[PDB]
Amino acid sequence: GYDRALSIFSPDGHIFQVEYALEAVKRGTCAVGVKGKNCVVLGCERRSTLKLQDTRITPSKVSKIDSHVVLSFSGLNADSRILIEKARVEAQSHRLTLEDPVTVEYLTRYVAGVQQRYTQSGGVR
Amino acid sequence: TTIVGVKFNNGVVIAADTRSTQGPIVADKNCAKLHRISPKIWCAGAGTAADTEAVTQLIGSNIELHSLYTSREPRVVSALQMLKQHLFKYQGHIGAYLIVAGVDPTGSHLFSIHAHGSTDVGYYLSLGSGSLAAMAVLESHWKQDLTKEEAIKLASDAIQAGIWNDLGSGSNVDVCVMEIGKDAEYLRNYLTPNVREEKQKSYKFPRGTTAVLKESIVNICD
Amino acid sequence: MIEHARTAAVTHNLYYDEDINVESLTQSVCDLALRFGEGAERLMSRPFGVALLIAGHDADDGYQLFHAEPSGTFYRYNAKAIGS
Amino acid sequence: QFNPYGDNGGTILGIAGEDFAVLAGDTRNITDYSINSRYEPKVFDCGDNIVMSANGFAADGDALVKRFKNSVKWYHFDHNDKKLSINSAARNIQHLLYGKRFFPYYVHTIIAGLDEDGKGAVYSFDPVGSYEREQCRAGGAAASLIMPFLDNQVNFKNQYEPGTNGKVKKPLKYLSVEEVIKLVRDSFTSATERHIQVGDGLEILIVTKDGVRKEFYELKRD
Amino acid sequence: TSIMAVTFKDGVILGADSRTTTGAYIANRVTDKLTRVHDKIWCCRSGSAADTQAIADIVQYHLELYTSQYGTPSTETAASVFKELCYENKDNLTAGIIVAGYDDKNKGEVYTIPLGGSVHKLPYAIAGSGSTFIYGYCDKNFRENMSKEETVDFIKHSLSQAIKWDGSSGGVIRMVVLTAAGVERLIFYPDEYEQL
Amino acid sequence: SDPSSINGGIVVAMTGKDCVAIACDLRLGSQSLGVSNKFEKIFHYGHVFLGITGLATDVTTLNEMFRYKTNLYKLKEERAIEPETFTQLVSSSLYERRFGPYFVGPVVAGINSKSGKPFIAGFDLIGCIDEAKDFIVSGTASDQLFGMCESLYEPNLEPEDLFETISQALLNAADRDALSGWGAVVYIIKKDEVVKRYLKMRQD
Amino acid sequence: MDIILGIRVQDSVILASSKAVTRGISVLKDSDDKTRQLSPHTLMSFAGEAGDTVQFAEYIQANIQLYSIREDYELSPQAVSSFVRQELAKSIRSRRPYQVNVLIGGYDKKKNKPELYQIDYLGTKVELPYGAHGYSGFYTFSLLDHHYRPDMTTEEGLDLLKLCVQELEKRMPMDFKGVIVKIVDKDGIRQVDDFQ
Amino acid sequence: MDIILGIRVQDSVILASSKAVTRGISVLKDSDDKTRQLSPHTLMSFAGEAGDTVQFAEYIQANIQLYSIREDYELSPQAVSSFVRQELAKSIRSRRPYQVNVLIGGYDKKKNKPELYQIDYLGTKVELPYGAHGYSGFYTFSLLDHHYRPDMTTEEGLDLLKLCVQELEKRMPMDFKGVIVKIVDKDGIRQVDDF
Amino acid sequence: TQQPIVTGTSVISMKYDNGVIIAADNLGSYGSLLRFNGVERLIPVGDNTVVGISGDISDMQHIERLLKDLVTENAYDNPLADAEEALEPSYIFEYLATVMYQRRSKMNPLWNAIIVAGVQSNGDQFLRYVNLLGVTYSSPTLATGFGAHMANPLLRKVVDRESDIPKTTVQVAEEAIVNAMRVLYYRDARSSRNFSLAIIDKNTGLTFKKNLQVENMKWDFAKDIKGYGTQKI
Amino acid sequence: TTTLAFRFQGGIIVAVDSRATAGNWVASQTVKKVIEINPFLLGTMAGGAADCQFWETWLGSQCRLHELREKERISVAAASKILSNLVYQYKGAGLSMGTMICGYTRKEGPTIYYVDSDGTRLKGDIFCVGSGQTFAYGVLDSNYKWDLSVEDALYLGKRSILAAAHRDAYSGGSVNLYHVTEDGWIYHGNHDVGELFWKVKEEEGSFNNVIG
Numbered sequence A: 001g002y003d004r005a006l007s008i009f010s011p012d013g014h015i016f017q018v019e020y021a022l023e024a025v026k027r028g029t030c031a032v033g034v035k036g037k038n039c040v041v042l043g044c045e046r047r048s049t050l051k052l053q054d055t056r057i058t059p060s061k062v063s064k065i066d067s068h069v070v071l072s073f074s075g076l077n078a079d080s081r082i083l084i085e086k087a088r089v090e091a092q093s094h095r096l097t098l099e100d101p102v103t104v105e106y107l108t109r110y111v112a113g114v115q116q117r118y119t120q121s122g123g124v125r
Numbered sequence B: 001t002t003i004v005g006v007k008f009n010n011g012v013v014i015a016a017d018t019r020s021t022q023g024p025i026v027a028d029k030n031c032a033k034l035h036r037i038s039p040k041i042w043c044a045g046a047g048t049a050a051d052t053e054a055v056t057q058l059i060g061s062n063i064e065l066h067s068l069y070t071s072r073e074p075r076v077v078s079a080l081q082m083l084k085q086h087l088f089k090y091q092g093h094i095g096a097y098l099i100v101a102g103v104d105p106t107g108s109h110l111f112s113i114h115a116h117g118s119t120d121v122g123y124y125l126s127l128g129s130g131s132l133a134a135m136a137v138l139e140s141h142w143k144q145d146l147t148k149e150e151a152i153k154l155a156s157d158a159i160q161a162g163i164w165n166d167l168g169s170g171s172n173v174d175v176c177v178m179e180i181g182k183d184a185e186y187l188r189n190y191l192t193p194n195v196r197e198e199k200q201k202s203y204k205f206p207r208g209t210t211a212v213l214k215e216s217i218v219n220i221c222d
Numbered sequence C: 001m002i003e004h005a006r007t008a009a010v011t012h013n014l015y016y017d018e019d020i021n022v023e024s025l026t027q028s029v030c031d032l033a034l035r036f037g038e039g040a041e042r043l044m045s046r047p048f049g050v051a052l053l054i055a056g057h058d059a060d061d062g063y064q065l066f067h068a069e070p071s072g073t074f075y076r077y078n079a080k081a082i083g084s
Numbered sequence D: 001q002f003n004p005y006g007d008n009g010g011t012i013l014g015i016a017g018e019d020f021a022v023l024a025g026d027t028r029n030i031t032d033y034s035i036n037s038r039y040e041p042k043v044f045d046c047g048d049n050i051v052m053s054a055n056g057f058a059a060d061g062d063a064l065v066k067r068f069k070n071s072v073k074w075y076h077f078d079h080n081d082k083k084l085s086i087n088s089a090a091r092n093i094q095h096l097l098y099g100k101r102f103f104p105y106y107v108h109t110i111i112a113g114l115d116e117d118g119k120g121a122v123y124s125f126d127p128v129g130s131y132e133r134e135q136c137r138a139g140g141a142a143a144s145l146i147m148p149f150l151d152n153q154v155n156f157k158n159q160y161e162p163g164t165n166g167k168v169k170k171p172l173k174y175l176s177v178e179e180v181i182k183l184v185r186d187s188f189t190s191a192t193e194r195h196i197q198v199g200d201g202l203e204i205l206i207v208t209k210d211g212v213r214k215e216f217y218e219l220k221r222d
Numbered sequence E: 001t002s003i004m005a006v007t008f009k010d011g012v013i014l015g016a017d018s019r020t021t022t023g024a025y026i027a028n029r030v031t032d033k034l035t036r037v038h039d040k041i042w043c044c045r046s047g048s049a050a051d052t053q054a055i056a057d058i059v060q061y062h063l064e065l066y067t068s069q070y071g072t073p074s075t076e077t078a079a080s081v082f083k084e085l086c087y088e089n090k091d092n093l094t095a096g097i098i099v100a101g102y103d104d105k106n107k108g109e110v111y112t113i114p115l116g117g118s119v120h121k122l123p124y125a126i127a128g129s130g131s132t133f134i135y136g137y138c139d140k141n142f143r144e145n146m147s148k149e150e151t152v153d154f155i156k157h158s159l160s161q162a163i164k165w166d167g168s169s170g171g172v173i174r175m176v177v178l179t180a181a182g183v184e185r186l187i188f189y190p191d192e193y194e195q196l
Numbered sequence F: 001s002d003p004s005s006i007n008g009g010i011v012v013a014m015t016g017k018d019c020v021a022i023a024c025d026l027r028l029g030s031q032s033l034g035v036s037n038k039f040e041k042i043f044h045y046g047h048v049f050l051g052i053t054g055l056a057t058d059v060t061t062l063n064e065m066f067r068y069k070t071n072l073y074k075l076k077e078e079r080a081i082e083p084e085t086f087t088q089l090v091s092s093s094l095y096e097r098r099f100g101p102y103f104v105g106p107v108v109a110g111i112n113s114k115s116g117k118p119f120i121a122g123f124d125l126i127g128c129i130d131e132a133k134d135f136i137v138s139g140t141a142s143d144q145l146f147g148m149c150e151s152l153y154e155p156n157l158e159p160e161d162l163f164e165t166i167s168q169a170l171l172n173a174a175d176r177d178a179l180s181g182w183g184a185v186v187y188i189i190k191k192d193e194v195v196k197r198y199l200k201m202r203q204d
Numbered sequence G: 001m002d003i004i005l006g007i008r009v010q011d012s013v014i015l016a017s018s019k020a021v022t023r024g025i026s027v028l029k030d031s032d033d034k035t036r037q038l039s040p041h042t043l044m045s046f047a048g049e050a051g052d053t054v055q056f057a058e059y060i061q062a063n064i065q066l067y068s069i070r071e072d073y074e075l076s077p078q079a080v081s082s083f084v085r086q087e088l089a090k091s092i093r094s095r096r097p098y099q100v101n102v103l104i105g106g107y108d109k110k111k112n113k114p115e116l117y118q119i120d121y122l123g124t125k126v127e128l129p130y131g132a133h134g135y136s137g138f139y140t141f142s143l144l145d146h147h148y149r150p151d152m153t154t155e156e157g158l159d160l161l162k163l164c165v166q167e168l169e170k171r172m173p174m175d176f177k178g179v180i181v182k183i184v185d186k187d188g189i190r191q192v193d194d195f196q
Numbered sequence H: 001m002d003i004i005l006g007i008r009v010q011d012s013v014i015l016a017s018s019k020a021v022t023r024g025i026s027v028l029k030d031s032d033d034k035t036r037q038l039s040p041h042t043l044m045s046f047a048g049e050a051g052d053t054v055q056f057a058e059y060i061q062a063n064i065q066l067y068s069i070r071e072d073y074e075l076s077p078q079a080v081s082s083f084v085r086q087e088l089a090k091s092i093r094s095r096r097p098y099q100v101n102v103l104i105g106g107y108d109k110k111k112n113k114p115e116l117y118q119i120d121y122l123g124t125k126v127e128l129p130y131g132a133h134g135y136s137g138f139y140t141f142s143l144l145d146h147h148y149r150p151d152m153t154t155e156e157g158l159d160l161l162k163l164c165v166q167e168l169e170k171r172m173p174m175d176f177k178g179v180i181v182k183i184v185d186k187d188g189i190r191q192v193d194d195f
Numbered sequence I: 001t002q003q004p005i006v007t008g009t010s011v012i013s014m015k016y017d018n019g020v021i022i023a024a025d026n027l028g029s030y031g032s033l034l035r036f037n038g039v040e041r042l043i044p045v046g047d048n049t050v051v052g053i054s055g056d057i058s059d060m061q062h063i064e065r066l067l068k069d070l071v072t073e074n075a076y077d078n079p080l081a082d083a084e085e086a087l088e089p090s091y092i093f094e095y096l097a098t099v100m101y102q103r104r105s106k107m108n109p110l111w112n113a114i115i116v117a118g119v120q121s122n123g124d125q126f127l128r129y130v131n132l133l134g135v136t137y138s139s140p141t142l143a144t145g146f147g148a149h150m151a152n153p154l155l156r157k158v159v160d161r162e163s164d165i166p167k168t169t170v171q172v173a174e175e176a177i178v179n180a181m182r183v184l185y186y187r188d189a190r191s192s193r194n195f196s197l198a199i200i201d202k203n204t205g206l207t208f209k210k211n212l213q214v215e216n217m218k219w220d221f222a223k224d225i226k227g228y229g230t231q232k233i
Numbered sequence J: 001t002t003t004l005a006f007r008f009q010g011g012i013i014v015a016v017d018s019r020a021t022a023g024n025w026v027a028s029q030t031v032k033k034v035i036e037i038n039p040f041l042l043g044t045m046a047g048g049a050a051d052c053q054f055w056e057t058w059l060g061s062q063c064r065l066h067e068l069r070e071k072e073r074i075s076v077a078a079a080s081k082i083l084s085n086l087v088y089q090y091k092g093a094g095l096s097m098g099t100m101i102c103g104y105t106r107k108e109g110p111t112i113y114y115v116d117s118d119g120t121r122l123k124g125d126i127f128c129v130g131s132g133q134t135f136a137y138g139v140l141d142s143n144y145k146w147d148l149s150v151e152d153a154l155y156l157g158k159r160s161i162l163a164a165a166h167r168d169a170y171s172g173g174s175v176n177l178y179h180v181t182e183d184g185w186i187y188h189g190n191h192d193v194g195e196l197f198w199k200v201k202e203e204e205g206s207f208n209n210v211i212g
């Protein structure tokens, strides 16, 4: 129904909504990833350290998409949940149709394609 | 199959094609469909070919026996009645549709018999697959007081229309004329329009073409 | 765009048992360029932000190099540079 | 209930020689035991030296012929007037036929032409699109009657060289256009003699590197 | 098929068409649907030509033997023969018969035997495919003890209307008049009963 | 499924100059499965040959019945039966079971012992007498045999040429039918000599 | 169906028959002898519709024993095969035909030769070096086409039959619970006690 | 049908499944594992129409694995059985219903108890000490009614399954080419190497 | 249409030297009842085309509506609709044929047999056939129903091949058509004595004759037919 | 139609016939029943001619798409499951197909899958599909062994197809042979049954049942 073109080009050749999403990313907690010779480490920042916060149930910054791929994020948490759900569903679908867990590259490319579609579709940011 | 019968001033003519087909395939390209029930009582058949042959031969045998018993010339009405009763007894399961014509001491006669056992009388009749074409020709060219040559031409043209405009009728035209004062005349291949052209080649194989595994002389005597 | 090209190529094989002409592939790719706007079949919001150099070879027009823009227009260059 | 299918008979034949192809068909369009027309051609030239015939249901055959001609028109429009390869045409016809995999064109399809190397070629399609490149193929009513003859006189099946003790096959050789014309004429005369749905006229399209030419011959009208 | 039989002062008159059809094709357009089983006892036949012909032949044989043995039969006797033959073979027959006879005692009589073998004596009987179209005309025009010419005209009009509306009936109108004077055969051609 | 198409098989007879020929396939099978490579379908009584295609059990029963009848005929007439008389006998025997027919297609061939004329004829399952002067075909590949004969045959062939023609016709018609083949036999018949030849063909 | 196999080797005929009888979803017996000794030098294995099989087999056995007593002579295997074939061919066109398929193996003593005949319920008789009834052939035939040899011994034939049984037990959907193996030779009929 | 048997023993669930798959008159395979591990402590054996079986099994497997990843938690066997039952009950009234019967065996860790569920293609779910699909039950049940005991050991359950397999091989018209036997307990799912 | 109700019978047509002739009865049959008399089954389109339809009368009226609408739409924005861009017989045929094949392939066909006959702009005689199956064929003589069995054999005795068309005159072809109509009235139970006849001649244009009757009928011999065999009176 | 495929030490052997029939009528005997999906994947057809041909060519197209997308050869498992999911989406529509997908990958090794229109998908070592699959199965299982040489395995496949062509009436024409190894598929010729039968009869001392 709602197909208003929200992500369009600017006279200087810029898609403003994408840059403002990047700015929203710059406002989120920090995340880092490092590759070893045979291991990968993901570190994340906790918003200061509040005392009335229940740390046993609050979602962690690192979420598993499959048994062998993990995902950290920076930016809006809700959009992260959406991307994580789509990525897990796609991982299970690839397992179902290929009888082989997905590669990190394939899942990464799927997430990137989802985001790109969201940067070129109408009625969505 | 296209069979017709036309009565002329001094007798009756019947005519038919010469095509026996096992469905859509031609089996006999010169099948004789005119059957002799009596030396002067003939019958053209359509439908189950074996049924037509068998019923004509059986009624002809019975007619010969009856003519020997009564020492009289066989009558067309007798063959008509016997064929009718026989076919009706078998509830039309004998697929034979006949046009029976002839000359007897009572004069000239032409009838048609439907396989379920019904009979019709008329001066011109037609039956078979291509019956419609022949009947159209008859209704177009028939008149009262036909001569011998006129009725012959009419029947031949009806059979020709059946041959040309029906897939179930073809090859050559057979005719049988029966006049009162003469003997019956059975013209086989009265018209031979469908003659095959010369083949573009001769496929006589060079001897030794076929490979043989074993030979043997067969003993036919004793 | 690349996906739409690749499938199209293979589809032209499946439908015709032969390789698709370079110009035909480039034209099929360009057919997506101006498939944008509002209204609505729903179309994308913005045109593409990438230009393409499509190089290939067929037995009809030999070796070919094409420039494809989000304007729906494509040219054939003996040599072409795009970017900065 | 309404039956959406029908049979119009007909017979088509396709042969491929050294530098030529030939697609012939009978010009008789029929229905049940009646003839619709004695000259209704069904072997069409589609351009790019590609002749096609889809024999069987006349409506489906005409629809398929029109669809393939439209497909070649749009293929010229959308690919810089590129010549449609005979194998490309065969693949497109396979897809056309399989489009109605669950409501098929009740037609046996045969196309003829020249391949990329300029040599004769024939392609045959069942009603759903299983296509195959061959050198000889007959389709339609009299197909079962013509196909073995071809195997004997074109591929030299069962023909061994005389005296070779049934060990050396006959040397396979390409036939001349005159020889394939002779074989086609003989095949169609035989089909007209033995099959009631074949006859009236034979139309032959000959596709050489010089184009498409026509030869018409009369057939029996029984 | 359109058949009828009408009684009047001088006797009885039967009438029928001459169209025997196999489906939609006119197998015979000059059919004699008026059959005689005895000198002054005739029958109008409708239905299976084969079945009607067989029934009529057997009835004529039975009436001939009845004449040779016990004398001239009554019309009711021929009606009873037809009724027995039709009712005892109802499962394998499809024939509707109208038996019309004349004698000096009962003058002219008409019996009708439909499917199933029932038999009914009526002043006038109509039967056949076309009869359904002329029920009203006959019920409104039939009279008791008409003259010969009035009976012929009534039968002519009724059969002409039946032939006009019914495609299963056609050809010519055949009539057989049974009176004390004997048997008379009349024929009416399309160019006469179509203008009625 | 169909009674005539359970076992399969083909028989074809041709005529020539002072000679006849009759050939048959050597296959007996239960539909798809092939069982026997030695099931000949051409039998002979004196100097009259009969090929029987169709339901195998009916083929054997008719062979035994015709052997019976021909033996009794020879005993009563003190002479061998002629091909025309045997053809009439076959027609009458077939029609005798009109409403429970034998699912066969008989083909009679031979040389009239007295007139020396070659004679061939064919029948349907109810005995319709189909007498042709050129060729008679029967079996599952009846259409293939019809085409091959109507194409290859020419009248007045010598035995050595008639053999080649009938053999090529039979082989090329059998290669286009799945229910016939697995071998073939050809009888060439003259006035006082009958030669039987086993052909070589593909065994699929 | 059941497994009914036969193989003719030089100087012997071997017959194999399923041991299992199954009605419904229950195997009622696993030791069923599907053969009847028609004569000391002629055995017949059978399979088909329940009831008809044993009935037809015992009927043929009774007739063959009566003929043997009447003439004090044993019919050649060819004669027994022809007789049973005629019986089946008369049965097919009866009211209730026999639905039994049979293999007949016999040592012709007047010819000193093994013979094997295959007949179906229709009356189709064939003389084959090896035969089978039901679906069994669809496998076994192939094996035989590769491994059969005319100059084989009875032990070689038993080994070939064991190969056929192994292939059947490997690729058949039904468990026929082994086979009973019988050998017919110049010394009569014997039964292999242990085959697998 | 195929042989699909299940028996719930104290602290374990044993599932047996025929190894034979036959299309036409030829046994195409004699080593077919008719089970799918829905979760580390829940296995499902299946049998029915060709094609539909493995399709439905792998679909259920994908859904259960997705639920396990999404929540980082394993569904109880009861919940998995309820999900499969609802799926089948929605399927039955669809255009082309799934014609697959399933046995679900799982060791509920929150209750430390073995559980076995039987569901047919209609969506009729039951929790039974022993269950079977197809004609197999028509024999096995009787044996169990006589030989089952609640306080049995896993080895005793294996022996009871061996008795059932022997009875089937004796009185069944079809040769199912043995069975694959798997045990689901607190330590997960294992496969009996020699049965 | 899934089953025809009110139906019209045969339609006959043939070519001659300067044009074509078509004819059809004026009968609408409710099964075995000759229900409606005076039912024109020849639809003239333009001054150069006539469409003869047999079969379901409701579908024939639908095709009449379609032809009228086609003429109206061709008149739109066409200054040459009265000249070089008028409706040709081939256009009308191809349209009807496409429609018939489409409705067949949708399993709801028009229960009809159609014969389109006319003269093209260049004087050529067009005569072609279509039916509920969409089968199309063209012959110098075309008939539907019983006509195809009886009319065609008579009409081919005048024009057995294309080369016979220049030799046939308008009088010959019209007499043949009238004789075929008489034969149909003889041997067709679902036929009528009243019919209509159209002549599309490349010189005289369209000649449409209505309220014709079959005349010169031979029925006298019916007086000599007595009994079905052995009966003498 | 008769097709067979079996794994051995030297990879995979595939052997098909070439006869296609429309009832009792032998429609053709020049039918190529092995579809070269790619230089490493083969597809053997049995059943619906158009069905099998069309959908295996479509499977080859899908494999090309997968190779272009992931820059990696498609696995035999995934290739077979694509066609399996396709025919299952067309299940109950009237498709009649029985196919064998054979391939050699580094992950799986030599692999053979059977896929029919019923939706069944089975990984196996020895498969025979078609009307004459029983005769094939017989000869194979009688003379099969994993330690066969390439020559011996090719000969065994050819001989099984030959037996199936002899006995089964709907299988025949010619034998097409294929050897699938690490380097892809290798075509080993088209052998006419007419001559191959006599050759095998003379060289093996078998087929003594034939009168030839």
Ligand SMILES: C/C=C\NC(=O)[C@H]1NC(=O)[C@H](CC(N)=O)NC(=O)[C@@H](NC(=O)C(=O)[C@H](C)CC)Cc2ccc(O)c(c2)-c2cccc3c2NC(=O)[C@@]3(O)[C@@H]1O
Pocket (backbone or CB within 6 Å): B001, B019, B020, B021, B022, B023, B024, B027, B028, B031, B033, B045, B046, B047, B048, B049, B050, B052, B095, B129, B168, F004, F123, F124, F125, F126, F128, F130
């Ligand atoms: C001259 C008089 C008619 N002339 C014909 O030429 C007629 N043909 C025949 O009677 C052929 C002749 C032959 N040589 O066998 N008989 C068979 O086919 C026989 N069936 C068989 O063999 C088979 O079961 C095979 C499987 C099929 C070939 C017997 C039979 C069985 C059922 C029938 O309904 C008919 C005949 C039948 C009745 C009426 C009209 C016709 C019939 N059949 C047609 O084909 C025809 O239409 C034609 O008119």
Ligand SMILES: C/C=C\NC(=O)[C@H]1NC(=O)[C@H](CC(N)=O)NC(=O)[C@@H](NC(=O)C(=O)[C@H](C)CC)Cc2ccc(O)c(c2)-c2cccc3c2NC(=O)[C@@]3(O)[C@@H]1O
Pocket (backbone or CB within 6 Å): B114, B116, B118, E001, E019, E020, E021, E022, E023, E027, E033, E045, E046, E047, E048, E049, E050, E052, E094, E168
């Ligand atoms: C008595 C005066 C006029 N009678 C007619 O004019 C009647 N026509 C005939 O009986 C034709 C004539 C012919 N020479 O063919 N004969 C057959 O039909 C024969 N069956 C066949 O042909 C067949 O296989 C099919 C069964 C029919 C296509 C015999 C028969 C069998 C069962 C029947 O229920 C009837 C006739 C029947 C009864 C009532 C009215 C009519 C009947 N049949 C019709 O056709 C008619 O409608 C018409 O009224």
Ligand SMILES: C/C=C\NC(=O)[C@H]1NC(=O)[C@H](CC(N)=O)NC(=O)[C@@H](NC(=O)C(=O)[C@H](C)CC)Cc2ccc(O)c(c2)-c2cccc3c2NC(=O)[C@@]3(O)[C@@H]1O
Pocket (backbone or CB within 6 Å): D104, D106, D126, D127, D128, D130, J001, J019, J020, J021, J022, J023, J027, J028, J033, J045, J046, J047, J048, J049, J050, J052, J096, J097
């Ligand atoms: C795969 C390797 C070999 N393939 C075969 O060997 C198979 N042959 C064919 O498919 C022939 C070949 C040809 N004419 O070129 N084509 C048709 O039949 C085609 N038309 C027709 O059915 C018709 O006329 C219809 C009336 C109108 C379209 C298509 C078709 C349709 C439905 C089917 O259910 C099948 C095929 C089918 C499936 C499984 C096995 C077989 C089939 N059909 C059979 O005949 C066979 O049994 C044989 O196995």
Ligand SMILES: [Mg+2]
Pocket (backbone or CB within 6 Å): D191, D192, D193, D194, D195, D196, D197, D198, D199, D220, D221, D222
């Ligand atoms: Mg012809």
Ligand SMILES: [Mg+2]
Pocket (backbone or CB within 6 Å): F174, F175, F176, F177, F178, F179, F180, F181, F204
């Ligand atoms: Mg064969």
Ligand SMILES: [Mg+2]
Pocket (backbone or CB within 6 Å): F204, J164, J165, J166, J167, J168, J169, J170, J171, J172
């Ligand atoms: Mg074979």
